[PDB]
Each structure stands twice: as structure tokens, then as C-alpha cells.
Design a protein around this ligand. Structure first.
Ligand SMILES: *CC(=O)NCc1ccccc1C
Lengths: 244, 179
């Protein structure tokens, strides 16, 4: 993550991030809406940062320090470049929506009134198709990635030393290889929960209530499609096990 | 400092997200209760043993039968949750959750947890339940369910008041350490 965005999302809520005198000017229903919108962005910042730990800290560090057989790193980190491109684009759109909404002379006071359109764009057409195919691939290679990590940590002394070294910092306590992989699998199932609670406080403007309702339906169509496309890959599976 | 993994399972509004948030946050959420729980690695010292307890939620996965079991690999203790204000969520403990957890987590201790125990003395809760011929889950109905499903134990807590929350997590650490 970058310092600017981390400070912007360091507070425990939107009501705590904006200046106290700016919060006082808004209705409770708006404060409650902005709180869930702020949580959606704050957790999307964290999601993108989890994918940067996988690509830049784990994946790249392994390639440059270790001498692993080609294809082992890809098996440890399936689709991480594609996931990083999908989510980094989404995060850029959300942070710009917040930036546009800032009061002049302020870097922290804002109200996002339109979100539904952005969620409909992200979860419809080509972008949604790419996301459906990427998460079906990732979750089908999830178990294999974990079996592969465990195999390497228990057999290679050098790989063990690399892990202990890069995971030692306190800021990496929740972010080891296995944790990063479950964090990524669990992200997609967080979107309907956040969007539903944003929708619960977005009835003031009918176009918005309708856009958030369409977005909720699109995220569930996608989740149902990823769940249907999943088929766990086994590390060293035999053809006979696959066709029976 | 040994590493153990804990996963909480249960129906939609059984209070599992609220429970993980209130335990992990040393700071009660007076201003805003987050909608989602990411993950957390807790520092627990139970009976003189220091353990790093990874906490995970299954909220949002309840309708996706192929995505959900990706949360189970290497779990050392399962917290099976139900809401004391929802006898319907208890009925699903033996028919749906217990068989799934025994299948993907053979020999992993399960602690049956009754959340929102404070709602047993809430006027609005009792008035609403009585409309559909129901009443708050009784302590013995929880104990009997834990007994029937072969649970390691039965515990009750209240995420709202924090009562019994720390005891659940220290007990789950003891369960995770057993071999
Ligand atoms: C989710 C739950 O069990 N209780 C909700 C609650 C209400 C007020 C303050 C804190 C919490 C966790």
C-alpha cells in the first residue's frame, strides 16, 4: 500500500476519518451509508495489498533468491498477476470516486453519492467475464498451492529459511503464503455482504437503490458461476481419478 | 509459540462475524461494527502455553458449496455457531453443518457455541419468537445438541456485552492443542 491511501483509510470508520465539524453537517442515514462505502474501499485497499505481498514479496523473492524448478512458483501463486490487474483497476476507480467527491481545501472530507454504476460496470460484461474465469482458475488451484507450499517448507531448508526471513516483520503476522491464498479466495464472497448493507442505507435516491440492487444481483450471478466452475486440482493426480 | 487454525461455521445471522471482530479487536467497536472480518492471528496464553491462533470466518460462503470447503484445510478447532434468538439456526446444526465439518475435518474438535445469550432476556426477542410458536434457545437444548452431534463441548457467549467471549477462545486453544 501507499502512505497517502493508508492514512486516508487508517480510521476505524468514515465517521471517524472525516473532520468532526464535517460529520456534524450530515444526516445519520448518510453517515451509516458512508461507513459501509468506506469499509468496501478500505477492505479493497487491503485486498490489493495482500496481492502485492504475493507478487512482490513472495513470488519475486523466490525467483531471485531460490533455485526452484520452473513452474513451482506458478503453482504456489496461480493467477496473481491477473488478480492484481483486476483489483488494482477496481481500487483505482473507487479511490478516484472518493477523490472527486472531496471538498475543496480538504483531503479527508467527502460523501460518495453514486457507487451503483461503478459496481455494475465492474461486475458486468468483459470485466466480469475475466473475473469469473480468473476466480474459477484460482480456486481450482487453491488446494494444490497449499499442498505445494507445505511440501517445500518440510523438504527444503533454503525455502524454510526464505519464509522465516521475509515473514519475520510484525506487519506480516496475518500474511504468510497460506493465509494470503485463503484471503484471496474469501474476498469474492465479501462483496454481496458489503453491497447489501450499503443498499440498506441507499433508499434516498431511487436510481441509486436500483443501481445497487442490480449490482448485488450481478455479484451473485458471478459467485454462482465461479462456484460452478470449480474443480479441485490434485498435486500429482492420475487420469483415472479425474474421469471417475 | 505454536501455530493453530480456528474456523467459525454456522448459518447467516448466527453472530460469528460479530464474535470474531469483538475478540480480535482490543478496542470495543462503540462507533461502527464492521460488516466483514478478514483474518487475524491472536496471541493467546492458555494454561501456561503460548499459541498463535489464526481466526477465520465463513460468512458469505453459506450458499456456495464448492467455494466454502476451501476455508477448511489444516483447521485445528472448529467453532460451530448458532444464535440463541433463532431456534431455527440450531435445527441446522446436525442436519447440515455437522456432516460437512466431519467430512472435511475428520477428528478436528468442534465446540458448539450459542451466541447472543443476552437476547434470552430481551422483550422484543421473546415477543417476536412467540409469534411463530417459538422461544429463545434454552441452555439444556444447546447442551443436548452439543451432546448429540459429538461436540468437544458447549459454551455460551455474548458479543454485545463481551461476556464469555474470552473463555470461548481460550477453550478453543486448549481443544486445538489436544492430540
Ligand atoms: C453481532 C452480535 O452478536 N452483536 C452485535 C453488537 C451490537 C452492539 C455492539 C456490539 C456488537 C458486536
Amino acid at each position: 500500500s501507499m502512505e497517502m491511501d493508508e492514512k486516508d483509510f487508517a480510521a476505524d470508520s468514515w465517521s471517524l476519518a472525516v473532520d468532526s465539524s464535517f460529520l456534524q453537517q450530515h444526516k445519520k442515514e448518510v453517515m451509516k451509508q458512508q461507513d459501509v462505502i468506506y469499509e468496501l474501499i478500505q477492505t479493497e485497499l487491503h485486498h490489493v495489498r495482500t496481492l502485492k505481498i504475493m507478487t512482490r514479496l513472495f513470488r519475486t523473492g523466490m525467483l531471485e533468491e531460490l533455485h526452484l524448478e520452473p513452474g513451482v512458483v506458478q503453482g504456489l501463486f496461480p493467477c496473481v498477476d491477473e488478480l492484481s490487474d483486476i483489483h488494482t483497476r477496481f481500487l483505482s476507480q473507487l479511490l478516484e470516486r472518493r477523490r472527486q467527491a472531496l471538498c475543496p481545501g480538504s483531503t479527508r472530507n467527502f460523501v460518495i453519492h453514486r457507487l451503483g454504476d461503478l459496481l455494475i460496470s465492474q461486475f458486468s460484461g468483459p470485466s466480469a467475464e475475466q473475473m469469473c474465469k480468473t476466480y474459477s482458475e484460482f480456486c481450482s488451484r487453491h488446494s494444490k498451492a497449499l499442498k505445494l507450499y507445505k511440501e517445500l517448507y518440510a523438504r527444503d531448508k533454503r525455502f524454510q529459511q526464505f519464509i522465516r526471513k521475509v515473514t519475520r516483520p510484525a506487519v506480516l503476522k496475518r500474511h504468510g503464503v497460506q493465509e494470503c491464498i485463503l484471503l484471496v479466495t474469501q474476498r469474492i464472497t465479501k462483496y454481496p455482504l458489503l453491497i447489501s448493507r450499503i443498499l440498506q442505507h441507499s433508499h434516498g435516491i431511487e436510481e441509486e437503490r436500483q443501481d445497487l440492487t442490480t449490482a448485488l444481483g450481478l455479484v451473485k450471478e458471478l459467485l454462482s458461476n465461479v462456484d460452478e466452475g470449480i474443480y479441485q486440482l490434485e498435486k500429482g493426480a492420475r487420469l483415472q481419478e479425474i474421469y471417475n | 509459540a505454536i501455530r493453530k487454525k480456528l474456523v467459525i461455521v454456522g448459518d447467516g445471522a448466527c453472530g460469528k462475524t460479530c464474535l470474531l471482530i469483538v475478540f480480535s479487536k482490543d478496542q470495543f467497536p462503540e462507533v461502527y461494527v464492521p460488516t466483514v472480518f478478514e483474518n487475524y492471528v491472536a496471541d493467546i496464553e492458555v494454561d501456561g502455553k503460548q499459541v498463535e491462533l489464526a481466526l477465520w470466518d465463513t460468512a458469505g460462503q453459506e450458499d456456495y458449496d464448492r467455494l466454502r470447503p476451501l476455508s477448511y484445510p489444516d483447521t485445528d478447532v472448529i467453532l460451530m455457531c448458532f444464535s440463541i434468538d433463532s431456534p431455527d439456526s440450531l435445527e441446522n446444526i446436525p442436519e447440515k453443518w455437522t456432516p460437512e465439518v466431519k467430512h472435511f475435518c475428520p477428528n478436528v474438535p468442534i465446540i458448539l457455541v450459542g451466541n447472543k445469550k443476552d437476547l434470552r432476556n430481551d422483550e422484543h426477542t421473546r415477543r417476536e419468537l412467540a409469534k411463530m410458536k417459538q422461544e429463545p434457545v434454552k441452555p439444556e437444548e444447546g447442551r443436548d445438541m452439543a451432546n448429540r452431534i459429538g461436540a468437544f463441548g458447549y459454551m455460551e457467549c455474548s458479543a454485545k456485552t463481551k461476556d464469555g467471549v474470552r473463555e470461548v477462545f481460550e477453550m478453543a486453544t486448549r481443544a486445538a492443542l489436544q492430540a
